């Protein structure tokens, strides 16, 4: 998933 805040995948 893309993290709304950074932008990064987790």
């Given at each position: 998933?893309?993290?709304?805040?950074?932008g990064?995948?987790?």
């Amino acid at each position: 998933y893309y993290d709304p805040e950074t932008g990064t995948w987790y």
